[PDB]
Ligand binder design. Structure first.
Ligand code: 8LR
Ligand code: 8LR
Ligand code: 8LR
Ligand code: 8LR
Ligand code: CA
Ligand code: CA
Ligand code: CA
Ligand code: CA
Ligand code: MN
Ligand code: MN
Ligand code: MN
Ligand code: MN
Lengths: 4, 237, 237, 237, 237, 4, 4, 4
């Protein structure tokens, strides 16, 4: 999810 | 479930479960949701050092994570471990990767625990030091993907033959002997742990982190605890 | 004046200079008027143990004083020794008597300090352990009335040939080598001291106490510092 | 069969298998028939101390057994443990009685082992110290009649309710963690062990002794190894 | 004159005083003419390690000097230090150069001594560890040309601005605290010292070497002891 | 003179 | 039976 | 003058  | 006390070096922000929005170090008491966190300027590809200390006088669990010639990150949490952990525990290192990955390479790890009894004032002590790991390190309990011996290092999660980190990995190394971490009849109990680590993500999208942890003696990687659960917790509660 | 950080085991209440009205343990930072004290149920003629700990993570000086099978006394004070002590110090034990007296007998004394570079993450360490003292203990600097060798003990203040403690006495024992107690370039700095002591007052009128202290390397017993000043301070400010 | 290297404190002369006609200490290499012995003036009912040392530079196993205020007994034997023991071992204490008996009480036990790699010149180390033993001590593997708890001691062989040592008893305590006792890639390897013991025989007819031993990791008491076999060997060969 | 026991890493063959015709390690007992030597394959400009051990059981002084991935050189000598050294000593490192020169850089130095009394069976201990050296390091007595503070190293002999070692230099570093190296009423006494060193001779013509030494507490560099005398001896007797 |  |  |  994050990085994304 | 297991009882976990851990210091996490969390390289990946899982905000949906309480992580701050940056890599951080944390004190985890029986939950992946750290009781306390500090911002951690993790340096991809560089060898770092974690020092963890606790004593029963201050009952303060503290940790400092640093890279050479950089400002350190520090986190501390007042906790009475007598009230959390069983008398006898195992100590270990854990790490995980998920969708995102990183090497979770441990280059050295030492630990000392001391327990001086109230009725006698004499000391019991355990100390181990590995500055190198062998291909068959019999005083380590390796769990999950953890392997030893490659370059003399402990790899907590899967790496390729050339050192490429793999996603969806989890592995732990526990010292073989149980540790008497507290005893009501002790004047002072204390422990310290130090380890050096090399977290590399050529992807530059690192996850999930490394933890030093203290657990019931029969602790194992909880089912499904790759990724954000750091090989420590059965769920995100 | 010297610079003194000390843990006092104060057997004699000098209420006119801030002592509480009972034997107490205290943390002294550059003053005999402790920054923090705890009630201490001294046991005349019984061997007790003092444990002192400090680390630069928590920056908290703590001490525990106990007798076997009794509740311990504990005292802690947050202090940044970086800002109080010189980088290099000597460590020692001090004791005094005044109008009233007590044996200030040390049966054992150990100390460990460790200092870990931030530029290198390598550790310097000093440890010494005395579980007996010889007549010519050359790694101790004895000051004032301190002697070694009778019953293999260190007598900080004057005693007669039968062990009868004398008034108006003051004496110190400093470990010979300076200690590198803090360094700004260090990731973590820590030390611990333990000593066992036998304070005996035949008339049950003990004074004045024993202190573990950390000082500038060239520290000496201040002129006149018998009695309530514990061989540590030049006045009661 | 197990592979055993041991230092025996042998209180009972079994002359038919090569014991000298006096209590003695001995170095046992894969046989109860010691490769080297020395007379030992065992003192019934008095706490003694045994110290065992080996290093890979001299490759010489030595032991000294002493009582306070008495001349010590010392024995040494050149042995290359690389050629005798497996790389990983467990270390332990063992004791036995037979037709005759004695208490085989261990009051304290400490061990340190260190391995310095030829490749890196960094050291792995293990140290433990027990100055008291607890009921249910999880870092000890107790075998046979060995128990902990009473007086904070380790009783290797059976003692009755009234404190009478029983005959035909055998018991051992092994430290839980395997020890990396030698390695070809090591520059220096060394270990030391120290234990204090109380051997007491009412009838002044003591048997059979105490040993510090090093063994294959999975070592167990050889069946029938009471009496002269010291809990170590399956026969007297 | 001083009383010296030393382990020499002698890089320069003085065949007229008994040196073999190659760099060698040696055990020196009150003379520069080693009681025992071993061929040493000195590696110019590489970091080496030296480990020195002695215990009063075997009464064998042994040393091993090695470089990573190279065979070690080992030398050993039976000697009763009770009959050579004073009870109290200082320990140090010394180095010299002569017509030929080399850097005599010490990167780390650790020492541990232990002394267990026959009367009490309790142990006194000293341990220090320098993994870096600071400017004005107050727990070292620097003598002659020895300096600290560049690169966190100890330079025993003179190095000029351009990094070139200077000839006819001699320097030593003694640990500040005296060491109780033997005692008649000790059960077992032992010490060990380890140091890492970097000897570089840009013209491949190195001299003269580095020694770990133990001396009378007030030992100073003998005048004129550059060159083959290693900063230790006043003459070549 | 605490104990007087 | 050494004691006997 | 060993090395010359
Ligand atoms: O989009 C977020 C992906 O979540 C997975 O990957 C992360 C990072 O590896 C991990 O924390 C999480 O548990 C999931 O595996
Ligand atoms: O009655 C007052 C006595 O004071 C002297 O004795 C006490 C106890 O030893 C001491 O603290 C004080 O400094 C004076 O010496
Ligand atoms: O009288 C014969 C003794 O032999 C037995 O008892 C001794 C002493 O305990 C023991 O060494 C031997 O093995 C036999 O058990
Ligand atoms: O050519 C003889 C040189 O002797 C001097 O230099 C050597 C090597 O430095 C040294 O051992 C000797 O003592 C003299 O100083
Ligand atoms: Ca996370
Ligand atoms: Ca007072
Ligand atoms: Ca026998
Ligand atoms: Ca020479
Ligand atoms: Mn987190
Ligand atoms: Mn006070
Ligand atoms: Mn025998
Ligand atoms: Mn020579």
């Amino acid at each position: 999810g994050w990085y994304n | 479930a297991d009882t976990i006390v851990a210091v996490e070096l969390d390289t990946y922000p899982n905000t949906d479960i309480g992580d701050p929005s940056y890599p951080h170090i944390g004190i985890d008491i029986k939950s992946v949701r750290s009781k306390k966190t500090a911002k951690w300027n993790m340096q991809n590809g560089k060898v770092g050092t974690a020092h963890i200390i606790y004593n029963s006088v201050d009952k303060r669990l503290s940790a400092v994570v640093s890279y050479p010639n950089a400002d350190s990150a520090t986190v501390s949490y007042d906790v009475d471990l007598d009230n959390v952990l069983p008398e006898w525990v195992r100590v270990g290192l854990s790490a995980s990767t998920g969708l995102y990955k990183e090497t979770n390479t441990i280059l050295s790890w030492s630990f000392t625990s001391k327990l001086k009894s109230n009725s006698t004032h004499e000391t019991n002590a355990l100390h181990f030091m590995f500055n190198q790991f062998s291909k068959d390190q019999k005083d380590l309990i390796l769990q999950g993907d953890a392997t030893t011996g490659t370059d003399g290092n402990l790899e907590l999660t899967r790496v390729s033959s050339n050192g490429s980190p793999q996603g969806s990995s989890v592995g732990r190394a526990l010292f073989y002997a149980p540790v008497h971490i507290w005893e009501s009849s002790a004047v002072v109990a204390s422990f310290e742990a130090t380890f050096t680590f090399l977290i590399k993500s050529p992807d530059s999208h690192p996850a999930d982190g490394i933890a030093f942890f203290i657990s019931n003696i029969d602790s194992s990687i909880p089912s499904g605890s790759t990724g954000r659960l750091l090989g420590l917790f059965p769920d995100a509660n």
